[PDB]
């Protein structure tokens, strides 16, 4: 979907010959959704407040419907609600929220959560209505900067092991988001790892390391770990990746309150376990615009953090080089307790050109671009696509 | 690992978006500068051999388009809030010079004036007219679409450029469609995925 009004099918093979192109009359595009899991009928939203329903076929498409929304208002964004219930949430500028019952597509609470630079809010839907559930705005001088939620994950391993078959039980709580606050004159990049349901903070980590606030900073939320990156000076004027890894118990063998036979914990109430964390950071040569995570259908391989730089270059570095609880490698030498083949902490990550994708391509991504990871089969391989001003994949 | 499938597997598209300004080049006369996709903090400036889709280089510069002007050529640009100005060389985008004291000079870029000189489209079909002796050389059908002629070069390395449809763009030379371009793909906001795919007991034994 273009920023203008146009949809079109691009082939992932054959060097992206245009499979088909359809023109709208919406005059700017905001979002795309498959109306059902069948992947046959799209709904596409106007900037102006119309929506179109389009029939994707091997033939050229047909506009099977155009219609207004309930109120002809300008729309800021749309958040995908349930596949089965066929609901959507629309955030209008003027900060007005609309529940969206689109079509048949021919207690049981739902929680949905949205971010602005003014704050992080949270919202709950009940009884065909939306209600504010809480609010968290930063103060005047402050400004929320970077945000990410927890992408859902298919589960392989409930715990990270040690050399002597001992287990640390990586922390798996699904209702988490993480975010940044930057405050002027404090020069304090504050990191919070917030329960996105309730609002409890669980973690604070500041850095009075002379941040810049002028270079990009970004946050990505992993399987059991979080990475956010910023630029600052006091260690050195260099790009900085910070990794925090969330564990049930820092003790070598403890499953803290995770028995699951029939306990059936409640997040809404707040009797959940709370993690302990271990954090490290690293020294990086080049300024980082934006980060995301590789995937396949099953979260098997190393999750292979992908980075997009200022120059347009892309680079992937594995998850494993970013090991919190790493050691500076004098104390690892037959230190049996650490891990199986623990790669050391090694804060200086030099750039290795072998990693880089777009080997000699330019790939001007424009001011606002996104990285996405498209799963495939053949789990050694994954698609990562850079959509925005320029399109690119690999 | 990479040398075998270096360009085979990697798959890049370059988009410029709908043109706003196009300026011929001081040297390599089958070449211009392509200005496109304005934004409130910056715009897309690139260098391009006219006789292909071969983009020579691209840059995002932090100026609204109106600052970008020729000299009194040397493609002068002047910030308006401050007095900051950048002089960039057309052929190789070298920042000839910078200042804040004063802009060197400016010349607002001229309008097309292509009609009354080189253009006539009379029988639903285009004819290039010489300014004198209007013999209607190099005539060409109007396609189903036509919005504008972006550019035309009458010199020895002849080239003509048409905004035929809103998003389709055709290059011509001495008529023959010489190359084809599409810039509907210049900015995508949101994305979705569609995949493709292929296409009692005793009787069971025998069948």
């Amino acid at each position, epitope marked *: 979907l273009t920023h203008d*009004g146009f949809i079109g099918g691009l082939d992932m093979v054959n060097k992206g010959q245009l499979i088909w192109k359809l023109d709208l009359e919406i005059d700017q595009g905001v979002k795309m959704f498959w109306t059902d899991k069948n992947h046959d009928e799209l709904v596409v939203f106007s900037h102006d407040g119309h929506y179109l329903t389009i029939e994707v076929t091997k033939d050229q498409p047909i506009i099977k419907s155009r219609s207004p929304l309930s109120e002809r208002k300008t729309v800021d964004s749309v958040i995908r609600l349930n596949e089965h219930d066929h609901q959507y949430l629309i955030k209008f500028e003027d900060k007005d929220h609309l529940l969206f019952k689109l079509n048949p597509g021919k207690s049981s609470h739902i929680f949905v959560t949205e971010h602005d630079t003014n704050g992080i809010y949270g919202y709950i839907i009940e009884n065909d209505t939306v209600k504010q559930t809480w609010k968290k705005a930063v103060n005047s001088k402050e400004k929320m900067v970077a945000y990410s939620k927890r992408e859902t994950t298919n589960l392989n391993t409930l715990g990270i092991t040690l050399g002597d078959k001992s287990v640390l039980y990586k922390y798996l709580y699904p209702n988490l988001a993480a975010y940044l606050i930057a405050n002027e004159e404090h020069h304090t990049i504050t990191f919070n790892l917030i329960d996105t349901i309730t609002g409890e903070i669980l973690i604070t980590q500041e850095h009075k390391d002379s941040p810049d606030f002028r270079f990009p900073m970004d946050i990505v939320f992993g399987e059991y770990w979080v990475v956010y990156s910023y630029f600052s000076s006091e260690p050195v004027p260099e790009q900085k990746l910070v990794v925090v890894e969330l564990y049930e118990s820092l003790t070598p063998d403890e499953r803290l309150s995770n028995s699951s036979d029939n306990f059936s914990y409640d997040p809404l109430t707040g009797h959940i376990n709370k993690p302990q964390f271990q954090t490290k950071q690293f020294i990086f040569p080049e300024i980082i615009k934006t980060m995301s995570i590789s995937k396949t259908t099953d979260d098997i391989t190393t999750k292979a953090i992908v980075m997009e730089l200022e120059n347009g270059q892309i680079t992937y570095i594995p998850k494993l080089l970013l090991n919190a609880r790493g050691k500076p490698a004098e104390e690892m030498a037959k230190d049996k307790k650490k891990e199986f083949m623990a790669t050391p902490y090694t804060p200086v990550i030099p750039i290795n050109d072998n990693f880089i994708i777009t080997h000699f391509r330019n790939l001007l991504p424009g001011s606002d671009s996104q990285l996405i990871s498209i799963p495939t089969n053949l789990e050694s391989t994954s698609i990562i696509c850079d959509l925005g001003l320029d399109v690119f994949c690999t | 690992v990479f040398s075998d499938d270096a360009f085979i597997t990697d798959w890049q598209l370059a988009n410029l978006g709908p*043109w706003e300004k196009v300026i011929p080049d001081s040297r390599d006369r089958n070449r211009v500068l392509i200005l496109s996709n304005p934004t409130e903090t910056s715009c897309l400036v690139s260098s391009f051999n006219v006789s292909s889709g071969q983009i020579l280089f691209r840059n995002v510069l932090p100026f609204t388009i109106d600052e970008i002007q020729l000299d009194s050529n040397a493609m002068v640009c002047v910030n308006s809030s401050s007095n900051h100005w950048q002089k960039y060389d057309l052929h190789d985008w070298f920042l000839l010079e910078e200042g804040v004291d004063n802009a060197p000079s400016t010349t607002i870029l001229p*309008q097309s004036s292509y009609l009354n000189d080189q253009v006539s489209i009379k029988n639903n079909e285009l004819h290039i007219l010489d300014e004198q002796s209007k013999l209607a050389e190099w005539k060409l059908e109007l396609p189903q679409g036509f919005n504008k002629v972006e550019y035309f070069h009458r010199e020895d390395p002849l080239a003509l450029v048409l905004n035929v449809n809103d998003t389709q763009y055709m290059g011509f030379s001495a008529l023959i469609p010489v190359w084809q371009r599409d810039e509907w793909l210049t900015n995508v906001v949101d994305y979705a995925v569609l995949d493709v795919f292929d296409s009692s007991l005793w009787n069971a034994y025998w069948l």
Partner: antibody, heavy 110, light 112 residues
Framework: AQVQLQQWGAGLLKPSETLSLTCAVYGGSFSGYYWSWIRQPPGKGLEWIGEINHSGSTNYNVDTSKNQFSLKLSSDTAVYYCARGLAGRGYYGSGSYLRWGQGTLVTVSS | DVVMTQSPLSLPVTPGEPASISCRSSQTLMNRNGNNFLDWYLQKPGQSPQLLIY???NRAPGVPDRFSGSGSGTDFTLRISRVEPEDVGVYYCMQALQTPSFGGGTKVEIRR
């Protein structure tokens, strides 16, 4: 018709004041076209040429926003259209107005 | 300063048939290159104007094949191959040499 225009205004203005309407662009190729208004008085008539260019080309019977691509004009009752005109000639334009504005209705009354 | 006049103020024509509508101007329309700079428009009620012909006899993009034009000098003509009931509304002349005014008002009246 994809690249189309949009109109702003106010519903009532008194007699004998300049009349503010503001266009808006959601499509490309601003520089290279002449952008004009049209009045359609009810009474089976239409007349206006106030065409303009990215550089000042004011020519009345008109402000532009190259940042926002929202052209603007402040001068009786009529229906008021934005438009999009070709720029064939050098500083004159070449008429041929297509992909019209969708219209404001103006009742010039106290 | 050019004043443009449409010959038929009302033209009742049965569905199906070819037809033509004429238009005249005070001055001459003829460019040095050979362009005439006279355009023909359609307006169905409840709609913004729609362009039909852009040089008096050519056709602008996104217009059916049925329509065509002719003429030069001070006089110009629209002409439809086949009339159909959909093309109902007022039809307008326009000159682009200087100060277009939209003098016209051909009101096709296909109801005899």
């Amino acid at each position: 018709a994809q690249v189309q225009l949009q109109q702003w205004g106010a519903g009532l203005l008194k007699p004998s004041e300049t009349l503010s309407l503001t266009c808006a662009v959601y499509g490309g190729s601003f520089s290279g076209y002449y952008w004009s208004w049209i009045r359609q008085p009810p009474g089976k008539g239409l007349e206006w040429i106030g065409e303009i260019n990215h550089s000042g080309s004011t020519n009345y019977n008109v402000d532009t926003s190259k940042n926002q691509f929202s052209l603007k004009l402040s001068s009786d009752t009529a229906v008021y259209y934005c438009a999009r005109g070709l720029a064939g000639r050098g500083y004159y334009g070449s008429g041929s107005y297509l992909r019209w504005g969708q219209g404001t209705l103006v009742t010039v009354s106290s | 300063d050019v004043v443009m006049t449409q010959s038929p103020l009302s033209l009742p024509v049965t569905p199906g048939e070819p037809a033509s509508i004429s238009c005249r101007s005070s001055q001459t329309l003829m460019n040095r290159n050979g362009n005439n700079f006279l355009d023909w428009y359609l307006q169905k009620p409840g709609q913004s104007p729609q362009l039909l012909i852009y040089l008096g006899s050519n056709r602008a993009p996104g217009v059916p094949d049925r329509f065509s034009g002719s003429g030069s000098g001070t006089d110009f003509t629209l002409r439809i191959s086949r009339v159909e009931p959909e093309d109902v509304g007022v039809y307008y002349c326009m000159q682009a040499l200087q100060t277009p005014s939209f003098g016209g008002g051909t009101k096709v009246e296909i109801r005899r």
